[PDB]
Design a protein around this ligand. Sequence first.
Ligand code: BCL
Ligand SMILES: COC(C)(C)CCC/C(C)=C/C=C/C(C)=C/C=C/C(C)=C/C=C/C=C(C)/C=C/C=C(C)/C=C/C=C(\C)CCCC(C)(C)OC
Ligand code: HEM
Ligand SMILES: [Ca+2]
Ligand SMILES: [Ca+2]
Lengths: 84, 66
Amino acid sequence: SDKFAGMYKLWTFIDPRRTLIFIVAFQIMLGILIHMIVLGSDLNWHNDGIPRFYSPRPVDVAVGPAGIPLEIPGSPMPQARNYN
Amino acid sequence: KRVPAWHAIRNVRDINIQYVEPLGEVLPASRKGPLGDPFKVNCLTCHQGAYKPLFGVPMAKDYPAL
Ligand code: BCL
Ligand SMILES: COC(C)(C)CCC/C(C)=C/C=C/C(C)=C/C=C/C(C)=C/C=C/C=C(C)/C=C/C=C(C)/C=C/C=C(\C)CCCC(C)(C)OC
Ligand code: HEM
Ligand SMILES: [Ca+2]
Ligand SMILES: [Ca+2]
């Protein structure tokens, strides 16, 4: 209604410089944050493989009866894993 | 790898209790220590600083005597 007609008076005790600075900084921060939240999701568009994958794909390593990769019988160092 | 080490312990005890220490009667005084007991077996007696002795080349299958 006509109850909002005197809202400009807001700027007689809230100043423009600090307000503009705060707004701009906050908007950039929010932009970066939302892009990173959507990237870390199922909606990720850089890594989805649409329209095509461009890098080579992961290759699994076969395991032994203990569930970890097999040792190689003359290697002078054990084999790496990442899961334990 | 913790589960083989658990067996290793027991294995070494066998080697030392049943076989090597009773040989203290047969060997000369050259093969004994200050307290008069023979030399015994450790983890280092076969690993010798590797995660498997000789990096795990299977030598023993070719000999049916062992
Ligand atoms: C796949 C797309 C992603 C998405 C990816 C991004 C990315 C990337 C960015 C945003 C940005 C914005 N997004 Mg978005 N956004 C999504 C879903 C939403 C939903 C929702 C209800 O689903 C809402 C409310 C928003 C709202 C917003 C604003 C907070 C922000 C705009 C800048 C700003 O200062 O806003 C003030 C303006 C408003 C609050 C009005 C805008 C609301 C818009 C129109 C959302 C309406 C959508 C919803 C379906 C409406 C339902 C109502 C009716 C049935 C039609 N998004 C989906 C999940 N969004 C940008 C930002 O933070 O810039 C600073 C930004 O970089
Ligand atoms: C010179 O002119 C003069 C000064 C004389 C006249 C000036 C006139 C003007 C311009 C006046 C302007 C006035 C304005 C712009 C007023 C705006 C007022 C607003 C938008 C007020 C909104 C208030 C909202 C409130 C108080 C909401 C509070 C919410 C609370 C406390 C929620 C608590 C929720 C909890 C704790 C839940 C937690 C949930 C969970 C699960 C995450 O917790 C673990
Ligand atoms: C108490 C000391 C010992 C410990 C803690 C120990 C521990 C282990 C461990 C953990 C492995 C598995 C290695 C791996 O898969 O990465 C292993 C293998 C092996 N150890 Fe020992 N060991 C000990 C003593 C010995 C001794 C004295 C010998 C010789 C008599 C020996 C012979 C072997 C052999 C042959 C293997 C390889 C077996 C395989 O291929 O799986 N170990 N040891
Ligand atoms: Ca894509
Ligand atoms: Ca025995």
